[PDB]
């Protein structure tokens, strides 16, 4: 067993979770305020996705010092370029340039309801979807461009990290 | 008018900001700052940076319908470019004898910023967390004073700039309480 063993898992039970959460904001009466609030809402997705990527980045690879500085650009360039947006906008049932764009409002939209009217819901969402879209790029990422001698480890940090991200959103939704 | 007190801000927001970077300075951790972990801090930096001030481009842009899109790129970009950070940077004394361009001294307030959020995020350390805040709403001051000055909106002019030049005098009071917590 190896970090193959479940990757095609992740990919189906990330839509299973997202897919519930999405589903249970479309009943929130909130859902509606999803003027070009739109490209507002863009334009911080954009940020917000951004600094959570450049997070996520600096949270893996610090651990391991055979990763030169060039990998933490290269993956957080890999981790929110359009192509890999509209990747995930694909998988999740939501051309490459407008998917990210909708990604990137939608994660902006969420973040600033929840921060308008306290609706906890749509800020999970937006934490489950970058949470995702990190892991989809990291697992294409690193098969590209191993690493020295911990691909293996690394990969394994970052999926086993997701698998249980994956649970915490499925403990965090019951309470809605 | 906003005017009048503008030269006021720059004075009381270096001293607020002096104190607590002095305060940093007397903390074990300061030196857990300043392998590559300088521009780790800087990659780092650059994002926060990013969505903080994209966050108060919405917060102050969107009361003003007046106030077109093109503006909120348009401040976005004034406000985290080389040269505002630069400003920033002389403005706060930050390297008085040494000799850097302008685009060094960018790099070394988002490698700061970045790096005082880190140290906050890992160690606890929230004076750290506070002193990059206050720098970043400081930038944020800066650039929209400026650039609304350059850059006048229908009607509303004055009243925005009112309105972050207030929200600014009310954060450093805010940093003023907060960092006494500290010496105290």
Redesign the interface.
């Known amino acids: 067993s190896s970090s193959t063993t479940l990757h095609n898992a992740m990919q189906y039970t990330a839509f299973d979770v997202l897919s519930s959460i999405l589903n249970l904001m479309k009943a929130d009466p909130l859902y509606d305020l999803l ?2 609030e739109y ?2 809402n863009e ?2 997705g ?3 996705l ?2 959570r ?3 996520l ?2 949270k893996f690879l ?1 651990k391991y ?1 055979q990763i ?2 060039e990998m ?2 290269g993956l ?1 360039i890999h981790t929110v370029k359009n192509q890999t947006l509209g990747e995930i906008f694909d998988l999740l049932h939501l051309e490459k340039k407008k998917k990210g764009d909708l990604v990137e409002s939608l994660i902006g939209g969420c973040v ?1 309801l929840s921060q308008r009217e306290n609706a906890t819901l749509f800020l999970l969402f937006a934490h489950a979807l970058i949470d995702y879209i990190f892991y989809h790029s990291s697992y294409i990422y690193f098969n590209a461009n191993p690493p020295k001698l911990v691909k293996e480890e690394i990969i394994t940090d970052i999926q086993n990290w997701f698998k249980d991200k994956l649970f915490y959103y499925r403990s965090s939704l019951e309470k809605y």
Request: charged content about 40%.
């Open positions: 003027d070009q490209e507002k334009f911080y954009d940020s917000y951004e600094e990527a450049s997070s980045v600096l610090r010092e030169p500085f933490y650009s957080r600033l």
